[PDB]
Amino acid sequence: GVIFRLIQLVVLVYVIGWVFLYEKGYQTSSGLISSVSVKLKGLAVTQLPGLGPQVWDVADYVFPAQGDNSFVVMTNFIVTPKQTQGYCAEHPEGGICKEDSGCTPGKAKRKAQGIRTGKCVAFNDTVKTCEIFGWCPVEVDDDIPRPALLREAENFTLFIKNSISFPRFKVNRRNLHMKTCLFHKTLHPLCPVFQLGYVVQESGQNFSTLAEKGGVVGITIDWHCDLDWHVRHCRPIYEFHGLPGFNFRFARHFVENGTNYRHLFKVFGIRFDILVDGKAGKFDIIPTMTTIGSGIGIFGVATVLCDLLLL
Amino acid sequence: GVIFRLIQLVVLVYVIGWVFLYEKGYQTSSGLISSVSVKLKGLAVTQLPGLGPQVWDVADYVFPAQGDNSFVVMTNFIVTPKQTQGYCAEHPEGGICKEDSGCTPGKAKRKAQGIRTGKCVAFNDTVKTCEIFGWCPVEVDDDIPRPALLREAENFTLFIKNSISFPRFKVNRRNLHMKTCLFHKTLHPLCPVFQLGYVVQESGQNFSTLAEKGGVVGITIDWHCDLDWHVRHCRPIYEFHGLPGFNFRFARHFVENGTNYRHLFKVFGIRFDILVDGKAGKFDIIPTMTTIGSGIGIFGVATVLCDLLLL
Amino acid sequence: GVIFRLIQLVVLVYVIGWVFLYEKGYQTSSGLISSVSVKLKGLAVTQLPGLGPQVWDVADYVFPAQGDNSFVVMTNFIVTPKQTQGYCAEHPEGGICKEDSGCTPGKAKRKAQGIRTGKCVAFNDTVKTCEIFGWCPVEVDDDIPRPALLREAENFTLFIKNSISFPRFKVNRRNLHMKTCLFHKTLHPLCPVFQLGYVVQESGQNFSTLAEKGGVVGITIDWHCDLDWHVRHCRPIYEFHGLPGFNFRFARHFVENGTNYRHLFKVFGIRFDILVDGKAGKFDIIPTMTTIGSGIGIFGVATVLCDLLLL
Ligand SMILES: CC(C)CCC[C@@H](C)[C@H]1CC[C@H]2[C@@H]3CC=C4C[C@@H](OC(=O)CCC(=O)O)CC[C@]4(C)[C@H]3CC[C@]12C
Ligand SMILES: CC(C)CCC[C@@H](C)[C@H]1CC[C@H]2[C@@H]3CC=C4C[C@@H](OC(=O)CCC(=O)O)CC[C@]4(C)[C@H]3CC[C@]12C
Ligand SMILES: CC(C)CCC[C@@H](C)[C@H]1CC[C@H]2[C@@H]3CC=C4C[C@@H](OC(=O)CCC(=O)O)CC[C@]4(C)[C@H]3CC[C@]12C
Ligand SMILES: CC(C)CCC[C@@H](C)[C@H]1CC[C@H]2[C@@H]3CC=C4C[C@@H](OC(=O)CCC(=O)O)CC[C@]4(C)[C@H]3CC[C@]12C
Ligand SMILES: CC(C)CCC[C@@H](C)[C@H]1CC[C@H]2[C@@H]3CC=C4C[C@@H](OC(=O)CCC(=O)O)CC[C@]4(C)[C@H]3CC[C@]12C
Ligand SMILES: CC(C)CCC[C@@H](C)[C@H]1CC[C@H]2[C@@H]3CC=C4C[C@@H](OC(=O)CCC(=O)O)CC[C@]4(C)[C@H]3CC[C@]12C
Ligand SMILES: *[C@@H]1O[C@H](CO)[C@@H](O[C@@H]2O[C@H](CO)[C@@H](O)[C@H](O)[C@H]2NC(C)=O)[C@H](O)[C@H]1NC(C)=O
Ligand SMILES: *[C@@H]1O[C@H](CO)[C@@H](O[C@@H]2O[C@H](CO)[C@@H](O)[C@H](O)[C@H]2NC(C)=O)[C@H](O)[C@H]1NC(C)=O
Ligand SMILES: *[C@@H]1O[C@H](CO)[C@@H](O[C@@H]2O[C@H](CO)[C@@H](O)[C@H](O)[C@H]2NC(C)=O)[C@H](O)[C@H]1NC(C)=O
Ligand SMILES: *[C@@H]1O[C@H](CO)[C@@H](O)[C@H](O)[C@H]1NC(C)=O
Ligand SMILES: *[C@@H]1O[C@H](CO)[C@@H](O)[C@H](O)[C@H]1NC(C)=O
Ligand SMILES: *[C@@H]1O[C@H](CO)[C@@H](O)[C@H](O)[C@H]1NC(C)=O
Ligand SMILES: *[C@@H]1O[C@H](CO)[C@@H](O)[C@H](O)[C@H]1NC(C)=O
Ligand SMILES: *[C@@H]1O[C@H](CO)[C@@H](O)[C@H](O)[C@H]1NC(C)=O
Ligand SMILES: *[C@@H]1O[C@H](CO)[C@@H](O)[C@H](O)[C@H]1NC(C)=O
Ligand SMILES: *[C@@H]1O[C@H](CO)[C@@H](O)[C@H](O)[C@H]1NC(C)=O
Ligand SMILES: *[C@@H]1O[C@H](CO)[C@@H](O)[C@H](O)[C@H]1NC(C)=O
Ligand SMILES: *[C@@H]1O[C@H](CO)[C@@H](O)[C@H](O)[C@H]1NC(C)=O
């Protein structure tokens, strides 16, 4: 008879501890719908690489300007100035040629830089490359600037505004001294102002390296909230992680004397992805009663098996 | 014996009414994957503030132009024209100085506007401020235009196209007289063309105030759909809510006589976030059978307790 | 007695096969949080329509340049060159007028193109239209170019980088010869480089038609992963589907001799939406024990009913 008492004990212990108190089996879970607003702050100066000092404001190093959940902060770039649409020699990458016979008119099949012509022109004092129609002069992105141009982006600040809501429960929570306040994993774990160097350091990456050629940093805001407790306990955890380099080409188009030109930029930047996930639970009677009924059922399959086995 | 009959009654009532008929405990829930397309319509004119009439088209007051789930409609702005990169006095905010001793060469630690120099120059006929290298002339954003410049944005129309799908069930639903049709919470509750003034009014905010200095308006499309009923009943509910002001700085870069300038804009706008959440349920046999088994289990723990207590 | 044995059989078969082995009722499900990076590749040339050859690079035909989950690839456009803000005749759409009496000063109520004036001016050698203040000359978008200008966009390549994570289980999965590798539904079903023509073909749409006037193509990455098996089996399925045309107006602003102009573009493009959904299950003891208890419960309601009915 003691064995049956022990069986009833293990099941009660399982049902109360594991099902209810440990895993919150008495609760009903809901996700959230969230909105994120990011505001960058800081100035950058590129003294030597800019041929005289050059200043980069928020209107310049943040893509997009209006902001988004995923945004890029430029940390380095190569600029091809005054590119016009006309005839020019292509990068030796397109292929080095030493006669007009090699050149084949028409667009190339791989790494096309324009429309080739049956002509060979000098790329510089040594290499002769196939003439093309396209944006000229052609870009040279081989030499990535090192050290990075916007290496002061590590001291920029990132202010994140997050407004979530658990629609099933009608609970709405925002994530906001704090003006002159900076986030530290432990010392200041609830201050929504982040420094980019610190964010990159917490993702496990080196800002010097992830600057000189770009990268991706994913920021996660975790709202794990037990709505049985007061909503004042519903607080966010900021989790930093890295999701080769990140680069993109953008072009500033301008007109001079009736002709359309453009400044081509190859932007090596850090793409920030603010991911917001959360689980809110609150007591419900249906899961509670379901767990107790299934538990009485396990008592039966256990007691009967023990008795039948004993018999 | 009557007590046992009553206990069997309460449980049947609970299981049938609350578990099944009220909370749809016989069903299996699925979320959705959605796509939103927004198309703005309207023109704005800024007669007096623009130094002669000025017209703002969709290509201008919507950020981004291509559209997105979250977009900004400019309602007011401050423009700093022909900013070049050169030497100039900084905003008195950087700090008022009355000699060259105060000026400290190098970028400042807080609110840096450029690269200071050991020189003091006149900001105007009274204040003398530290000379800086940066975009000049410097911006003055203290005087926010009131009334708003694009106060006609309240009469712009917002056409939202939403295409959802409940992938688990393979059900795809779109949210579309209606051309000349406008949405009213009650009179016209299914017309996807919204007027910005009405959307802001339904979020609880005043458009005059949320125009002069910006704001955030969140639009939610709720697809709560019972797939036991015909898909023609699967319809969206449009829920408007507000998620200080919203502002961003963008720059139009142009070239004049070989020199790079820019028009700096401080945009006070209303950011619209189209959030689309939904729950689709359809009958499943597993939850139904689970609910009945747990219910037979509760009958046991109830009948036994009553009998044992009576004994 | 045989009937009771058969009843115990049907329930065991149901519980083991349908509840556990078929529907994975012994498991616990988790969604995912994902990040998508898209990189376009290709060049386009518009020989005849461009009044001499015209070249379109990635910096030009992709909106936004930095990339996003939802992006637009321009396939056709109408350009209104050198639009200045001044006085001009409006499109005959605004309304044809044959005197000054018809013209009514002030902005129109529908399809407003500017600020009308009590004057009538000639649109061309035949129609006389109401004079307006606005961006002039006015746009004429009636004639959509056919064949499309960027009809070579079908041979552009779309490289998608997807990094998901199932946060509940702490499992992180990315979706990556493959450099010169192209995706085919069956032959190459795991190569993340897609060709736009093929993507559009797999959505059921014709690229010639969805080019000449735009469209929407939705790309879904499905991560259905059984974490009982090794993570090497957790792989993505690429599902292509179409979510009238898609068009947007963007403006390149430039300055000439102190005057602000703009190039107005009406972009007919294909909007790509990368939707990433997934379900990860892993064995849990709570659902397993819940299913067995409810099953013992069904045995009871079945055996008792059979006996009572027999009696
Ligand atoms: C084990 C089987 C046979 C069922 C018998 C036990 C359950 C009825 C117990 C176990 C765990 C209990 C839960 C543990 C914690 C809480 C949080 C508690 O939170 C509050 O509301 C307290 C603060 C406040 O009063 O605001 C409310 C009760 C609840 C849901 C308890 C409800 C009763 C539960 C489900
Ligand atoms: C063990 C047998 C007799 C079955 C009963 C199960 C118990 C383990 C349950 C029954 C009542 C439960 C308690 C009911 C209410 C609360 C208050 C609850 O308080 C909060 O968390 C609220 C805090 C806040 O409001 O911020 C903490 C759990 C506790 C002690 C529960 C712990 C688990 C208890 C003791
Ligand atoms: C209470 C315990 C002991 C179980 C006994 C009752 C259940 C078997 C009942 C209660 C609620 C019923 C559900 C209530 C509503 C509907 C919607 C109904 O929808 C239709 O398909 C009707 C329209 C059509 O025919 O297309 C289908 C049956 C269903 C799922 C019912 C299935 C049978 C359920 C689960
Ligand atoms: C009460 C005891 C005897 C146990 C049986 C539970 C009942 C409460 C269940 C059994 C059958 C159910 C019915 C089965 C089917 C339908 C049709 C269903 O119709 C729809 O919703 C379909 C409408 C559409 O197709 O658009 C509405 C619920 C109803 C009446 C159900 C209501 C609940 C009922 C009566
Ligand atoms: C039918 C009722 C009375 C319960 C009795 C049967 C269950 C205990 C069985 C049925 C289906 C079984 C599952 C079927 C498949 C798997 C995958 C299997 O995956 C592995 O881990 C195998 C590979 C490895 O060793 O890494 C682990 C056991 C599990 C979860 C099984 C656990 C035991 C289950 C739940
Ligand atoms: C039928 C009665 C006696 C109740 C027991 C239920 C059975 C149907 C269960 C019990 C053990 C289960 C097995 C336990 C473990 C595995 C290994 C599992 O292997 C994998 O999927 C792992 C592969 C990998 O690691 O990549 C496949 C299911 C299987 C055979 C299960 C199939 C279903 C079984 C036989
Ligand atoms: C002319 O251009 C070619 C091509 O850029 C130069 O050759 C490159 O030189 C660098 C530096 O040594 C190498 O890293 C590259 O591998 C070379 N490219 C090729 C295709 O050989 C060449 O040096 C240039 N000539 C001058 C005088 O500047
Ligand atoms: C010169 O510039 C300074 C700084 O903008 C002006 O001082 C400001 O005046 C306004 C209007 O009274 C006040 O609201 C600000 O608080 C003042 N700022 C500071 C730092 O004192 C000053 O008025 C300007 N002088 C002239 C003649 O225009
Ligand atoms: C002057 O402009 C009007 C308006 O665009 C032209 O009339 C259009 O002509 C086309 C071609 O036949 C028709 O498809 C449109 O329906 C006409 N519009 C209207 C409002 O009638 C007219 O042809 C132009 N005149 C010249 C000489 O070019
Ligand atoms: C950021 O500020 C610290 C403060 O000491 C400075 O040492 C560092 O050089 C700054 N980062 C730059 C300049 O990139
Ligand atoms: C990595 O970061 C450290 C500072 O944390 C820096 O000193 C080092 O130079 C970085 N790595 C490289 C290769 O420079
Ligand atoms: C501007 O273009 C015209 C037309 O080609 C040319 O005659 C003129 O010399 C150009 N002016 C300058 C300053 O390049
Ligand atoms: C919007 O239209 C109404 C129509 O009467 C007008 O009164 C109102 O002034 C308009 N909103 C503006 C001009 O901002
Ligand atoms: C609030 O809105 C009303 C119209 O609904 C307007 O009359 C009022 O002026 C607004 N508030 C303020 C402070 O102007
Ligand atoms: C254009 O720049 C050159 C070089 O500084 C200068 O000589 C010339 O006067 C400038 N022209 C005008 C119109 O400013
Ligand atoms: C894409 O490449 C194929 C290769 O044969 C070519 O036939 C086709 O014309 C190309 N698509 C264009 C040019 O739009
Ligand atoms: C549809 O696509 C086919 C090629 O798959 C093409 O030949 C045909 O012209 C397209 N439809 C139309 C109306 O052109
Ligand atoms: C530039 O604008 C000024 C001021 O209107 C005018 O006097 C001058 O002729 C213009 N120059 C050209 C080349 O249009």
Residue numbers in the entry:
A (entry chain C), B (entry chain A), C (entry chain B): 30 to 205, 213 to 279, 287 to 354
Paper text:
Our high-resolution cryo-EM structure of full-length wild-type hP2X1 in the apo closed state at 2.7 Å resolution provides key insights into the subtype-specific features of this receptor. Briefly, mammalian cells overexpressing hP2X1 were incubated with saturating concentrations of NF449 antagonist prior to lysis to prevent binding of endogenous ATP, followed by extensive dialysis of cellular membranes to remove antagonist before detergent solubilization and reconstitution for purification. As a result of this “shallow” gate, the overall shape of the TMD in the apo closed state structure resembles a “teepee”. Consequently, we observed density for and modeled two CHS molecules bound per protomer in the TMD of hP2X1. The two CHS molecules occupy a cavity between TM1 and TM2, at the interface between the ECD and the TMD, located on what would be the extracellular leaflet of the lipid bilayer. Finally, the succinate group of the outer CHS molecule creates hydrogen bonding interactions with the sidechains of residues W265 and H269 (3.5 Å and 2.9 Å, respectively) located on the lower body domain of the receptor.
P2X receptors are a family of seven trimeric non-selective cation channels that are activated by extracellular ATP to play roles in the cardiovascular, neuronal, and immune systems. Like other P2XR subtypes, hP2X1 exhibits a trimeric architecture.
